[PDB]
Unconditional design. Structure first.
Length: 603
């Protein structure tokens, strides 16, 4: 009796909802107020739960069910095809919290909903956020949640609901489809929603980039009276935001790897509503994902990727699909499988329970790292996920111009003027030039558009990291394919410039000892104040005895470094040749002053 209520009328402002007579339900009917026909954008459903928000069962249709206690918010969600999926959030707050869900609208829009909990301080200001949970659901649920759904609430006695309603923001149609939804699977999602932009700024100390986060799109209420203005606690301190991404297809590791190799937004490799086939996906995205899948099907150790590639190129099994896939694009296979192997090793080391094989289908957790902070600590509840740290990369610093791409005939759309502008933007953001990195065309695409990240390397564990040099002639030797293809051919590659955040300048060390020399290991340990390997440090020294300098960035520093293209071309007439110092533009030499490296330990 009197089960029914009207959330968007009675609880728009405030309602004390009676739970004493058993279950309460409200139709959330959007059909009168919003026609999803010819709309592309985001529905943001929210309500604030006050006193009596503990010991409740909440539901949206039969699709999403939440259980609340004082210390936890637990939920189970339906998925498109993989069956139900359960998450437990340990509360960071003790007072009110908002239930938020995002429903993307449009035939071309993403095939995931977002769920997240914003916890307030004692005085009712937004202070803490849960992980952003991304669930790939059926086309039917995506459509229904944008039309009519029912909200159920039950105790086991009343609950204070306020600011119940729904808002909408249209996707910007001036940006092509890939770019348009690029931040759907990042913490910058919060920058799409007017009430949370400043929350993101205060918690991450990163910009809400106008051109990447829909700035200027009108965020408007459709029903009820939801929170639209910022009410962020002014005392909010920096903290890592986590975005947990479920892949219904079970191909998370392959999709993550394709994102990192190709520099393609992770959303583009997610579930599609209707079979898509973007030019960037058919050329790089799908083939790279497919190579990881074929490697998994071969049942080979991730420790052996470089020997599997070598074997495929020099002593292949004819008609073996993995060998043939490697042979088609060997250098892409090197970048692809050494990235996936590093991700699998990192996953394995996150928990005793974790196995290489659980990595294949694990959720991705995207971490919004705090600007400048040298360490980006993962939340405890991310230990069962594939971690990717969001740091600015080269693509954020290319500035205005046509699309930059890497070819044997040279870097496209990359003038001295564009480099000077990029350099100026980097030093204005406190980044410091540390040297040149030579890579393959595919290596450059990955590092610039995907970001620098750990790859497995055939070398001593203690000397692992990104190998660069202050001397562009050293880098130049690596600015080509790492090994020949199946016909014994090597392509020229790309010269890159590498910049570290200014926060790392005290950890840029130098020794007269030879890098990668077993006899230098204890002396380098003494210099950096702990045994190798390098963490958030770099070491500079002779490449070989008496030789030219090189620099190793520890992988944890390298992740935070930015690579942009050099205007030093690779000469395709003289593949394997020495750098002609006459091919170095004076405008580049002028911006290439190197740091004052630390030569004695701090203590
Ligand atoms: Mg915004």
């Amino acid at each position: 009796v009197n089960e029914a209520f009207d959330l968007w009328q009675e609880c728009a402002t405030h309602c004390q909802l009676d739970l004493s007579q058993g279950i309460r339900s409200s139709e959330l009917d959007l059909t009168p107020l919003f026609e999803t026909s010819n709309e592309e954008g985001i529905l943001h459903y929210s309500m604030l739960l006050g006193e009596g928000n503990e010991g409740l069962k909440l539901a949206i249709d039969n699709a999403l069910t939440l259980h609340t206690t004082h210390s936890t918010i637990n939920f189970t969600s339906e998925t498109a095809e993989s069956g139900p999926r359960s998450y437990s959030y340990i509360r960071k707050g003790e007072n009110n919290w908002s239930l938020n869900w995002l429903v993307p609208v449009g035939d071309d829009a993403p095939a995931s909903i977002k769920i997240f909990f914003l916890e307030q301080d004692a005085v009712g200001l937004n202070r803490y956020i849960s992980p952003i949970y991304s669930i790939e659901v059926s086309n039917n649920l995506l459509n229904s949640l944008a039309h009519k759904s029912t909200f159920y609430i039950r105790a086991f006695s009343m609950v204070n609901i306020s600011s119940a309603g729904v808002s909408y923001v249209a996707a910007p149609q001036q940006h092509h489809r890939q770019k348009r939804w690029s931040e759907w699977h990042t913490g910058k999602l919060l920058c799409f929603l007017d009430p949370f932009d400043a929350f993101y700024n205060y918690v991450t100390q990163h910009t809400c980039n106008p051109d990447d986060t829909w700035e200027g799109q009108i965020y408007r209420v459709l029903a009820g009276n939801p929170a639209t203005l910022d009410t962020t606690a002014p005392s909010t301190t920096p903290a890592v935001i986590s975005h947990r991404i479920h892949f219904d297809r079970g191909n998370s590791l392959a999709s993550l790897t394709a994102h990192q190799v190709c520099g393609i937004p992770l959303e583009s490799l997610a579930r599609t509503r209707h079979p898509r086939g973007w030019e960037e996906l058919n050329n790089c995205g799908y083939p790279v994902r497919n190579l990881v899948s074929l490697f998994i099907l071969a049942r080979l150790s991730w420790d052996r990727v470089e020997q599997v590639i070598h074997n495929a190129l020099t002593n292949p099994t004819p008609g073996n699909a993995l060998d043939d896939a490697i042979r088609e694009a060997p250098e892409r296979a090197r970048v692809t499988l050494t990235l996936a192997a590093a991700q699998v090793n990192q996953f394995d080391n996150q928990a005793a329970g974790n196995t290489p094989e659980q990595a294949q289908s694990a959720d991705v957790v995207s971490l919004s790292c705090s600007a400048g902070a040298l360490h980006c600590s993962a939340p405890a509840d991310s230990a069962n996920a594939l971690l990717e740290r969001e740091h600015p990369n080269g693509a954020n610093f290319l500035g205005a111009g046509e699309a930059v791409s890497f070819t044997t005939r040279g870097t496209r759309n990359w003038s001295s003027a564009r480099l000077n502008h990029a350099h100026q933007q980097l030093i204005a953001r406190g980044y410091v030039f540390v040297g040149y990195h030579g890579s393959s065309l595919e290596g450059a695409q990955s590092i610039v558009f995907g970001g620098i990240r750990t790859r497995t390397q055939a070398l001593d564990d203690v000397w692992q990291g990104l190998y660069i040099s202050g001397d562009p002639a050293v880098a130049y030797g690596y600015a080509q394919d790492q090994e020949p293809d199946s016909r014994g051919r090597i392509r020229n590659g790309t010269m890159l410039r590498v910049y570290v955040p200014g926060t790392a300048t005290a950890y840029l060390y130098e020794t007269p000892l030879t890098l990668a020399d077993p006899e230098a290991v204890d002396a380098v340990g003494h210099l950096i104040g702990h045994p190798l390997p390098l963490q958030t440090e770099a070491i500079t020294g002779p490449e070989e005895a008496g030789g030219r300098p090189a620099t190793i960035l520890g992988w944890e520093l390298a992740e935070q470094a930015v690579a942009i293209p050099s205007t030093i071309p690779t000469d395709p007439s003289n593949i394997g040749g020495d750098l002609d110092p006459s091919s170095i533009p004076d405008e580049e030499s002028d911006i290439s002053a190197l740091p004052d490296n630390v030569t004695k330990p701090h203590h």
